[PDB]
């Protein structure tokens, strides 16, 4: 139904506010904020949000505390100031999906429409994207297991509208822009193998742990498509792709003649001015 | 940007009446680094659009 979402950095900055207004208690749970956004277009667009006092129990996961009156009052006053945005979904800032989150989700599946869930991180030490849109849908399973609410990842992008760019860019003065050429290309080309390395190494090690030490339907079926597509690249023999390397290598030779020739043209004013300025300022110096 | 002043008459109180684009005719002292007597009347000048200080004489 929905292919992608758009989450503005304002709400994650309000998750910085989630970690601001704590007051140092010793709890630091997955504090839930009431996500607001635009379900109106087929794409989901988050503008802003707020948060609600939410408590679980230490031992019991299934005890969870929300408010309808706080939702209708904060959403009521927010709709009074801006009715162009409505309720859409929610989020917890914990790294882990609890068992209770189907029931916590179910309250906003009832009163709000089909609500989206966002897992983000309490400490932004993850190099990966912190935000993951998990659609709250029940899907029919091939094994015959009974149908339950299933959180499939909807792909996400983090974009800012107009002024959030200006304010963020004014606050940083540290980030550099697009800046094609040597640096912004070559830095992605520096850390890029580390970026698939920590992804893959972060996945296949504990994945391999859940191979031998795991049960309880880990989606054993998607391992077959998984390993299948992984064996759709069986270390290509390159024999047809040799001429492709002649092609990129011949384009490389074009970059050779352009670099050599054009830099050699830049040598002109250099190797004129080096003589004609120095010897004339010298010969009229005395 | 800034406007285009045209002085038609210089006033002796160092408050030069300058003919401006319609709804203009804004009498003002121009900037202190430029003298008044150099600004010849019936000639076009360079004037700021709010502060009404002269930049230079124009042909």
């Amino acid at each position: 139904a929905v292919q992608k979402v758009v989450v503005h950095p304002l709400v994650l900055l309000s998750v910085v506010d989630h970690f601001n207004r704590i007051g140092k208690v010793g709890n630091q749970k997955r504090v839930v904020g009431v996500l607001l956004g635009s379900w109106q277009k087929k794409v989901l667009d988050v503008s802003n949000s707020f948060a609600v006092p939410f408590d679980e129990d230490d031992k019991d996961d299934s005890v969870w505390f929300l408010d309808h009156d706080y939702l209708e009052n904060m959403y009521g006053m927010f709709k009074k100031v801006n009715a162009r945005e409505r309720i859409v979904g929610w989020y917890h800032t914990g790294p882990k999906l609890h068992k209770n989150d189907i029931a916590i989700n179910e309250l906003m599946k009832r009163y709000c429409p089909n609500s989206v869930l966002v897992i983000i991180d309490v400490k932004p030490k993850d190099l990966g994207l912190p935000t993951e849109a998990y659609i709250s849908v029940e899907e029919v399973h091939d094994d015959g297991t009974p149908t339950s609410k299933t959180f499939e990842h909807v792909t996400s992008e983090i974009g800012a509208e107009e002024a959030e760019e200006v304010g963020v860019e004014h606050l940083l003065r540290d980030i550099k822009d697009t800046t094609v050429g040597t640096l912004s290309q070559r830095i992605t080309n520096q850390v890029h193998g580390l970026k698939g390395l920590n992804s893959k190494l972060l996945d296949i090690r504990s994945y391999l742990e859940k191979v031998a030490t795991g049960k309880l339907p880990i989606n054993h079926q998607i391992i077959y498509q998984l390993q299948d597509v992984f064996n759709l690249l069986p270390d290509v023999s390159l024999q047809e792709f040799v001429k492709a390397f002649y092609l990129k290598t011949n384009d490389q030779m074009v970059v050779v003649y352009l670099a050599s020739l054009i830099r050699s043209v830049v040598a002109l004013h250099n190797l004129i001015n080096n003589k004609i300025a120095n010897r004339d300022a010298e010969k009229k110096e005395g | 940007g800034s406007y285009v002043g045209e002085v038609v008459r210089a006033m002796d109180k160092k408050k030069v009446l300058v003919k401006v684009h319609p709804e203009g005719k804004f009498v003002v002292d121009v900037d202190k680094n430029i003298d008044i007597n150099d600004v010849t009347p019936n000639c076009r000048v360079a004037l700021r659009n709010d502060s009404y200080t002269l930049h230079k004489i124009l042909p």
Partner: protein, 229 residues
């Protein structure tokens, strides 16, 4: 904007709903927008300011105006009310006059000193902690990076073979299209050599053309890594 616009039971109602959440903070000021006609404050503004400063002695007033503010700079200023009985003495007895060199950045030649009497301003600095810094930083770098990040690499590596070859030929067309101009230049340099009349430089553009041309070289090794493993 008015003192009548301030609904006090709605104000204190939302305030108390913030109090039952994690916000036990008093109001520190009231702000608004003044689009188009400049950031200064009208008589309604100065009078409801005069009423709302009876409780808080500081009573900060801020005007955001992105309407004529460009997307390059987000210049905003917080404004102040002087006391009318301070007109006999010197105006602002503010110590530590270092930052006022930064406070002469509002130097528009009508509004600031055109309206600065009875009506002054205050400096603005920020704060950013490391969670905002690295969360917003990796948030913004990730806002310029990809998901698994290896995704759009081979795309442009192979648009070097599909699309950028056209931009390489057009690049050679702007190059050669300048070379027909630099064909005529050594006669000029073979005549005058004194003074420079052309604002066109012909060099740094072609350096940039080479920098865009080196994407082929930088992504060829990327193709070598993908072909490797």
């Amino acid at each position: 904007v008015s003192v009548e616009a301030v609904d006090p039971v709605f104000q204190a109602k939302m305030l108390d709903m913030l109090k039952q959440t994690g916000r036990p903070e008093m109001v520190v000021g009231w702000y608004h927008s003044h689009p188009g006609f400049g950031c200064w404050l009208s008589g309604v503004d100065i009078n409801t300011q005069q009423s709302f400063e009876a409780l808080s002695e500081r009573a900060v007033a801020v005007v955001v105006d992105p309407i004529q503010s460009v997307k390059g700079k987000v210049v905003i200023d917080a404004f102040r009310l002087i006391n009318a009985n301070m007109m006999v003495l010197g105006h602002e007895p503010r110590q530590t006059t270092s930052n006022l060199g930064h406070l002469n950045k509002p130097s528009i030649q009508a509004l600031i000193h055109g309206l600065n009497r009875h009506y002054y301003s205050i400096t603005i600095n920020y704060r950013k902690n490391e969670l905002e810094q690295k969360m917003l930083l990796n948030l913004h770098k990730k806002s310029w990076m990809e998901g698994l990040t290896l995704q759009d690499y081979s795309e442009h590596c192979k648009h070097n073979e599909s699309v950028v070859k056209e931009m390489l030929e057009l690049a050679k067309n702007y190059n050669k299209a300048v070379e027909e101009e630099d064909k005529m230049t050594p006669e000029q340099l073979a005549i005058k050599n004194v003074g420079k009349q052309d604002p066109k430089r012909h060099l740094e553009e072609h350096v940039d053309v080479l920098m865009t041309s080196n994407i082929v070289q930088c992504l060829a090794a990327m193709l070598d890594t993908v072909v490797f493993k």
